[PDB]
Design a protein around this ligand. Structure first.
Ligand code: NA
Ligand code: NA
Ligand code: NA
Lengths: 69, 69, 70, 70
């Protein structure tokens, strides 16, 4: 479900628009799920010139987060 | 600016079209805020049969949820 | 037919799903978006309107849950 | 409803909302963490536990989506 990405930080990104869950794979190896993420956040994250900078600015710490790997 | 239709087990429901945030009170006393909730989600919440059922199917776990009281 | 074409300075084609209440709008600029919990009548007024752009602006956009499909 | 105070070496108050599935834990460090999709019965075993901390760390932490709120 995860579309590949470029950042020095994250490898792939998946979205469940039906349930508002973002899923991010990171280059280190960890996979993390983000809850109640609005649609355009996922859109803006995917159309950012930098994917890693948008994540730390607008996503990390600001949505409920669970680890998956 | 709020209104007790109750529901399957709701208490009171209010909204801010101007800010796109929903407010919902529960029978256990709590009141929760929901952000970036589009207008018609708030409307056909209220035209629905049982509004808790809608809440639990179409709002819970889907918008930025923030305790207010 | 997925989407029926539309003459507008803004909208290109519109399609509707009677079952899951999803409207699909394509724009002359290329974007495609699905609109959830859209009532049948709302899709009817949009197609019957004399300015699809003006009806879309007033009665659809930023009012129903929006998803970008293209 | 506000949080209930608690006897633990790690947390100090806990509130729950059966309908929403929102847990709220206030720690003996001073943060408040909010846990989503927590079933009603996990919250009860927590308030009923001989050690709230040993239960929370084993069963709730790193098992439900978490968000810092204070
Ligand atoms: Na980067
Ligand atoms: Na037009
Ligand atoms: Na303890």
């Amino acid at each position: 479900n995860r579309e590949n990405v470029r950042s020095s930080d994250l490898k792939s990104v998946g979205y469940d628009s039906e349930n508002k869950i973002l899923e991010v794979e990171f280059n280190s190896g960890g996979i993390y799920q983000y809850s109640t993420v609005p649609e355009e956040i996922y859109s803006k994250l995917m159309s950012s010139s930098s994917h890693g900078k948008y994540f730390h600015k607008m996503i990390r710490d600001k949505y409920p987060t669970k680890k998956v790997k």
